[PDB]
RNA sequence: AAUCCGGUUAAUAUUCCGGAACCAGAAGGUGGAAUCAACACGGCAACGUAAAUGAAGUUGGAGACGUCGGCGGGAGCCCUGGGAAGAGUUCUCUUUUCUUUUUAACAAACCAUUGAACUACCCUGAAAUCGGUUUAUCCGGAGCUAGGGUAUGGUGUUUGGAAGAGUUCAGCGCCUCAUGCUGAAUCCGGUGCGCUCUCGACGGCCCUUGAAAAUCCAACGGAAGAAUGGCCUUGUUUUCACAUCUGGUCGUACUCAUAACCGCAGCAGGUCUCCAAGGUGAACAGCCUCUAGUUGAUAGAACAAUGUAGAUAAGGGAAGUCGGCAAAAUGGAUCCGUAACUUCGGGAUAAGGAUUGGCUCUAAGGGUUGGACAACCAACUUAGAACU
């Protein structure tokens, strides 16, 4: 069954704080608790540990990744990397 | 408290000793007015204050 | 039923005031004051607990014989078996690559 | 599966206080087998007299404390309390003492 | 306290110099315990036979102090 | 770093006594081990052993860490079925009711058996018709399932300690003395969404991610060593076993509170924390009880008005009053039913109804276990029927 039409995970807050505030928290909370894919291992075992820190499970790639507060990568970081790579590849040649 | 320092314990020993009656022959001396003393301390009444 | 008291003057449920109940050969129920539980040494590369070594408080390790505190292998008692295997293979392959890069530099 | 429960009562009989004959029918009427009085079909509990002994033979793993309980009832029926007392002496054997 | 499971092992500990005394304990179950007091430990050997107990008692060093409980 | 049980005093006890241990330091007192040239072997491996040379330097580990949630185990407690010993009751009934039926530190061997593991790791092997699997959906070609191993190990088992102790009962000397002496028992089973503590594997949460240091250990490294005449001949190891010496100094009585503290006091105030039985019940609620404690709060007689505290009331029902102030009424649980409005989460136990004892039955829902089945034992719910 659905159990909620709108509030989703934010149902824990009940009727407090205002709908817009709960909706904004809802979008972020879905992001920060999601599973993401490890580029180094290929498994979807990447979960957050405290705000910019994303860890991996298993016997392989027990590494920790520095990421965004609520998602593994940010758009600003992704755009910076390609900007940096372009600049690196143009002084290289 | 039964947890006590040596210095505290020494003071308690002295306090107990001064908390005794005077022997009568002390007050029987010619020219002595040691008949009664205002230094009889009791544990519930007047506190040592360390 | 029988109720118990701390056997020491420590009166609070701290981590140094751990107890368990014993029944004595006098049919007495009383406390026994016990230590914190030991810890197995952990791998320096992976953090895994190291096999073959008991969980003891740090100073209890001073009473064991040498072989109870280690494993008969390189880095035994300091690295796990799989960590050592990664180190050996990594060292060999990296050294070989240094050999080819030196050969192709001339 | 044979049991040797005996209620020795020499002490009271010498003083003409304990009727072993009365105690016989008391036990046979009172001893309960399978929750019922009168199920002594002689395959399980026999009972008998031993002159001064009321030896009871049991085949269903009886309880000698049940004998002591029934004996104290009998002594209570005849107001023999304050005067007599059932005391364990040997394995399955009880005695009457004036104390 | 330590248990000794071999009669040969028990006799060797008795022949040692730290072995002061021995104790004989006869349990209700007709089993016999030979207890040896050294400096650090009390060593018990359980002998489940009366014949074996007699032979073991005779097998002790002659100067050993064997005390009966 | 390291201590337990039993006993003992008028009054101390993990401190005394009896017994049984442990730790740390020093020297090296024996024994053992390795080394004929050098510092051991086993196992594919995880890793194993009675020991198994290791200087400087370095590196790693332990110490060392939040909080909530449920799940699994252990210990003590609780409950239950027999036996025994003593006691209570006994007009009648009650194979009855009550009490006792105990086992420490430490040591050894096992160990997922008996309870709790495929928890971690290793080996074989190579998985789609994908499988495995928790109460909780995580895991696997980065090697699943399966088969076999390795490690972690007690508040588990079997023992030592240890029945010689403790407990219960029954007798003997009988001014009795050192209060001595002599007999029996102290046994065998079961139970769990129980309680208290604890351990194990997990899950949730955080713009919150939850001390430090002393101290102990391991590794990497290779300093240094000197037995040799095929054997009577040294060093090391005391991180192997047994043995010896030593462990100072201060605290330790008692109260911890409706009389030992603070509040002028033997003041209805205040002052941190540990253990925690039975019944009812959801319950550490209220109510009653067992163990323990207490029966202490100036007393006697009487029952006037007015009080303080607590009850009840015809008919009416807020007319009382600034005002329903105070009181009354409601109340647990089960099944029905539940409006406006809303930030869609709530509102909501909305409102509003019905039921509820006792007894005797019926049905369904799980485990141990003997030859499609099954005689017990161990069990707890839920729903319904009849009778009263
Ligand atoms: Mg005292
Ligand atoms: Mg004291
Ligand atoms: Mg005061
Ligand atoms: Mg009225
Ligand atoms: Mg009325
Ligand atoms: Mg009305
Ligand atoms: Mg009005
Ligand atoms: Mg008016
Ligand atoms: Mg009111
Ligand atoms: Zn990964």
């Amino acid at each position: 069954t659905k159990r909620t039409k709108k509030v989703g995970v934010t149902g824990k807050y009940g009727v407090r704080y205002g709908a817009s505030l709960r909706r904004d928290v809802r979008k972020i909370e879905v992001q920060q608790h999601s599973r993401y894919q490890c580029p180094f291992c290929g498994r979807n075992t990447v979960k957050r540990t405290a705000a910019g820190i994303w860890c991996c499970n298993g016997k392989g790639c027990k590494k920790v990744l520095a990421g965004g507060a609520w998602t593994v990568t940010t758009a600003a970081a992704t755009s910076a990397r390609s900007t940096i790579r372009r600049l690196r590849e143009m002084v290289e040649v | 408290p039964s947890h006590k320092s040596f210095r505290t314990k020494q003071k308690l020993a002295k306090a107990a000793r001064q908390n005794r009656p005077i022997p009568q022959w002390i007050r029987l001396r010619t020219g002595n007015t040691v008949h009664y003393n205002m230094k009889r301390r009791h544990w519930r009444r007047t506190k040592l204050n360390i | 039923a029988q109720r118990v008291t701390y056997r020491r003057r420590l009166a609070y449920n701290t981590r140094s005031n751990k107890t368990r109940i014993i029944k004595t050969p006098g049919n007495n129920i009383r406390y026994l004051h016990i230590k914190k539980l030991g810890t197995i040494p952990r791998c320096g590369d992976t953090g895994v607990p190291l096999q073959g070594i008991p969980a003891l408080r740090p100073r209890e390790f001073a009473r064991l014989s040498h072989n109870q505190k280690k494993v008969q292998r390189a880095y035994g008692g300091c690295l796990s078996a799989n960590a050592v295997k990664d180190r050996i293979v990594r060292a060999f392959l990296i050294e070989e690559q240094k050999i080819v890069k030196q050969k192709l530099k001339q | 599966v044979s049991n040797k429960y005996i209620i020795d009562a020499t002490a009271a009989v010498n003083d003409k206080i304990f009727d072993v004959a009365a105690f016989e029918k008391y036990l046979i009427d009172r001893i309960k087998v399978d929750g019922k009085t009168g199920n002594l079909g002689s395959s399980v509990v026999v009972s008998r007299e031993g002159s001064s002994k009321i030896a009871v033979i049991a085949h269903i793993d009886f309880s000698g404390r049940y004998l002591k309980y029934l004996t104290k009832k009998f002594l209570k029926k005849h107001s023999l309390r304050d005067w007599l007392r059932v005391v364990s002496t040997k394995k399955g054997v009880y005695e009457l003492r004036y104390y | 306290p330590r248990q000794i499971s071999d009669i040969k092992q028990f006799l060797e500990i008795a022949r040692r110099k730290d072995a002061t005394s021995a104790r004989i304990k006869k349990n209700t179950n007709k089993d016999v315990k030979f207890k040896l007091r050294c400096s650090k430990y009390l060593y018990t050997l359980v002998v489940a036979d009366a014949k074996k107990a007699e032979k073991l008692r005779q097998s002790l060093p002659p100067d050993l102090t064997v005390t009966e409980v």
Side-chain angles (χ1 to χ4, degrees), chain D residues 7-23:
Chain D
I7 311 292
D8 178 63
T10 59
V13 165
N14 293 2
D15 292 302
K16 211 172 182 179
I17 306 181
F18 191 68
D19 197 343
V20 182
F23 197 63

Side-chain angles (χ1 to χ4, degrees), chain C residues 2-27:
Chain C
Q2 282 196 60
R3 284 167 288 181
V4 305
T5 64
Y6 283 134
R7 320 259 303 254
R8 291 108 178 251
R9 290 187 179 282
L10 178 42
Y12 309 100
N13 185 43
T14 72
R15 282 179 72 52
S16 70
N17 214 19
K18 229 155 172 271
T19 55
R20 76 176 173 94
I21 292 268
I22 66 168
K23 201 169 192 179
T24 72
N27 219 336

Side-chain angles (χ1 to χ4, degrees), chain E residues 26-65:
Chain E
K26 254 87 163 73
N27 303 135
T28 321
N29 36 292
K30 305 176 186 241
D31 295 319
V32 166
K33 280 173 169 175
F34 293 82
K35 311 191 199 191
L36 180 32
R37 170 79 260 177
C38 288
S39 166
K40 169 129 103 152
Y41 288 123
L42 175 79
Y43 295 100
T44 291
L45 159 64
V46 182
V47 172
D49 182 23
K51 321 269 192 177
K52 281 254 280 203
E54 178 203 21
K55 316 292 207 343
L56 213 165
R57 187 159 182 169
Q58 285 143 5
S59 306
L60 292 165
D63 46 332
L64 185 78
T65 301

Side-chain angles (χ1 to χ4, degrees), chain A residues 3-76:
Chain A
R3 290 202 274 95
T4 277
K5 329 171 180 324
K6 211 189 315 294
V7 296
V9 64
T10 278
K12 63 188 171 181
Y13 298 126
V15 310
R16 303 183 290 282
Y17 317 123
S20 294
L21 259 63
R22 279 189 285 106
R23 173 246 290 142
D24 305 333
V25 169
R26 198 213 310 127
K27 308 262 192 25
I28 279 142
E29 282 181 357
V30 166
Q31 277 179 317
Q32 79 181 90
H33 295 127
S34 296
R35 277 185 119 110
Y36 299 84
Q37 155 148 332
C38 188
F40 305 100
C41 82
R43 309 143 56 115
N44 281 69
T45 67
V46 186
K47 290 270 220 154
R48 205 200 72 166
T49 302
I53 301 175
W54 303 77
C55 284
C56 208
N57 305 40
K59 313 180 190 185
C61 69
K62 58 167 286 302
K63 92 190 37 173
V64 170
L65 316 174
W70 324 117
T71 55
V72 171
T73 76
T74 64

